């Protein structure tokens, strides 16, 4: 039997780990940028560091449903970026948390030491997000969020894992010469990731 990247157990485990990381990061971003009230969040522990978990079931299901669709792309190494876009009540993007991701074309079949230093890497990103409010201006009241996914290069509507996706428009993904705030860029044998924020200027 001939295997493709997605058939590798290691590719599936990494996809699981990264999808969970994105879930933790999305919850944290919503908390620190106050997209949802502090009242719905509860402090929990992840990667041995404090994080904030939404306790609103509907929001939690929405985030899981969304990220569950990114998992297969991660296994196939077809995801370039996952972006959390915060928009004001006028539907204008005010902040964009950009997670650029690159993965090797293959992973070892010798699964040993796969996630060796992964937690230290993910922890670094969470810590940066945790204090991002110190380098960003306060967002206006009534903001909402959307998640954008950029894939590796025909239907306008795509249904993945029973969840519908559509092409985003420059009407909600355009910022004229925005301020770029680097947060963290790290590399490892299984992943290279770069997180930065684009802020409306």
């Amino acid at each position: 039997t001939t295997l493709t990247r997605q058939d590798l157990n290691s590719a599936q485990v990494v996809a699981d780990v990264l999808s969970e990381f994105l879930e933790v990061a999305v919850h944290l971003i919503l908390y620190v940028r106050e997209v949802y009230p502090v009242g719905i969040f509860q402090k929990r522990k992840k990667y041995n560091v404090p994080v904030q978990m939404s306790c609103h079931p509907e929001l939690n299901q929405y985030i899981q449903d969304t990220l569950h669709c990114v998992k297969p792309l991660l296994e196939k190494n077809d995801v370039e970026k996952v972006v959390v876009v915060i928009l004001d009540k006028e539907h204008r993007p005010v902040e964009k948390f950009v997670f650029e991701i690159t993965q090797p074309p293959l992973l070892s079949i010798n699964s040993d030491s796969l996630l060796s230093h992964v937690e230290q890497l993910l922890r670094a990103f969470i810590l940066k997000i945790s204090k991002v409010d110190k380098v960003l201006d306060h967002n206006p009241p009534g903001c909402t969020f959307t998640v954008l996914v950029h894939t590796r290069e025909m239907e306008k509507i795509q249904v993945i894992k029973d969840f519908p996706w559509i092409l985003a428009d420059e009407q909600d993904v355009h910022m004229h010469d925005p301020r770029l705030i680097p947060l963290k860029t790290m590399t490892s044998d299984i992943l290279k990731m770069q997180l930065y924020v684009e802020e409306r200027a």
Partner: peptide
């Protein structure tokens, strides 16, 4: 790159939003 792609379903508001299919 392909996309960007976004969920057709908008993020839920604190309390369910209004009826507007289109």
């Amino acid at each position: 790159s392909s996309g960007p792609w976004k969920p057709a379903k908008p993020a839920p508001s604190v309390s369910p939003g209004p009826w507007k299919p289109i």
